[PDB]
């Protein structure tokens, strides 16, 4: 579990969105596993606007942060789950690092701010849904 709080927006993994997130829907994209909802209180997370390929992510299944080198956002095949059929997930970045079911929503950050959130994983890998291209989050 986990979310990004920036301005009047809450960014979560689309498959973990609540009834409240859907009732205050701003934008969602199944192909990216992202959903953004509106908030009443101001959020103070800063979004990175960069092309960093190194950062640090929070791994809830270890209660620890880990440094990672990650690939540029791309279209990656993701096996079927209870949430989605087998499909290509876009704007996904892979890294070597621990992740297990339950870790989605952990924040990935570089020196510039929030890069994305955990969205996939498996066999010593972790995948992050990029949010750096969503320029409207800051307005
Ligand atoms: C960190 C998650 C994980 C780690 C290690 C093994 C398995 C998983 C679960 C997994 O990758 N998925 C289930 C939930 C929806 C995800 C999606 N974005 O399509 C895919
Ligand atoms: Zn950066």
From Swiss-Prot:
* List of residues binding Zn(2+) 1: 50, 52, 110, 112
Q: What does this protein do?
A: Cysteine protease that cleaves viral polyprotein and specific host proteins. It is responsible for the autocatalytic cleavage between the P1 and P2 regions, which is the first cleavage occurring in the polyprotein. Also cleaves the host translation initiation factor EIF4G1, in order to shut down the capped cellular mRNA translation. Inhibits the host nucleus-cytoplasm protein and RNA trafficking by cleaving host members of the nuclear pores. Counteracts stress granule formation probably by antagonizing its assembly or promoting its dissassembly.
**Catalytic function, reaction form:** Selective cleavage of Tyr-|-Gly bond in the picornavirus polyprotein
Full protein name: Protease 2A
Subunit field text = Homodimer.
Please indicate which part of the intact protein appears here, giving the first and last residue numbers and the full length.
869 to 1007 of 2193
Q: Which residues form the active site?
A: 15 (for protease 2a activity), 33 (for protease 2a activity), 104 (for protease 2a activity)
């Amino acid at each position: 579990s986990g979310a990004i709080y920036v301005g009047n927006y809450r960014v979560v993994n689309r498959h973990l969105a609540t009834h409240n997130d859907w009732a205050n829907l701003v934008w969602e994209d199944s192909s990216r596993d992202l959903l953004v909802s509106s908030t009443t209180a101001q959020g103070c997370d800063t979004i990175a606007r960069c092309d960093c390929q190194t950062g640090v992510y929070y791994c809830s299944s270890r209660r620890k942060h880990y440094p990672v080198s990650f690939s540029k956002p791309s279209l990656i095949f993701v096996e079927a789950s209870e949430y989605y059929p087998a499909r290509y997930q876009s704007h996904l970045m892979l890294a070597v690092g621990h992740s297990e079911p339950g870790d989605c929503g952990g924040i990935l950050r570089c020196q510039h701010g929030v890069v994305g959130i955990v969205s996939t994983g498996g066999n010593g890998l972790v995948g992050f849904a990029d949010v750096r291209d969503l320029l409207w989050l800051d307005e």
